[PDB]
């Protein structure tokens, strides 16, 4: 549960995703797949690379990672409010995908990690609290739904 304040600067670090959201999208998922490659193994139209080369320069990852993370954003944008925009997501990712929310764990300190990267200095302590804040509630609200299907 985040304050208004807290949304406000949410969506104030949103911004600057969004004004390039395949970039950010592409390095979010390189992320993971170099940090955590036993997640590359949950993607049949990834696992074909080996190296963050093939990653940094596949336009299929940069345009899953506009997919993903217009997804997010739609979600962000809900404050909270993303019962709708989330249960498929959650249905989708442990009944067809099969996503332990450990994965979802890494992929969000990952967005954490790019913003920092992409924005050094401008990314503020305030800033990564309300984004993780944010982050963690999606990864909960995940884990209700998980719980629900008994799904590890
Ligand atoms: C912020 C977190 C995430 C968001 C917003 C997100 C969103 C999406 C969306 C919108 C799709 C396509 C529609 C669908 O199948 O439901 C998708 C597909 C998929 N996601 Fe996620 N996802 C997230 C995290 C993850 C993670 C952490 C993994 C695995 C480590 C993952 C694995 C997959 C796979 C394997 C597909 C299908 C890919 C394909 O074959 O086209 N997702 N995701």
Known sequence: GLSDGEWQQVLNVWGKVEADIAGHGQEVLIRLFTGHPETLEKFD???????????????????????????????????????????????????????????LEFISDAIIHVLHSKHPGDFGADAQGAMTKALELFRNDIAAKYKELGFQ
Do not use: N, R, W
């Open 45 to 103: 139209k990834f696992k074909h690379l080996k190296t963050e080369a093939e990653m940094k320069a596949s336009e299929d990852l940069k345009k899953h990672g506009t997919v993903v993370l217009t997804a997010l954003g739609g979600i962000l944008k809900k404050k909270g409010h993303h019962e709708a925009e989330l249960k498929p997501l959650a249905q989708s990712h442990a009944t067809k995908h099969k996503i332990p929310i450990k994965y």
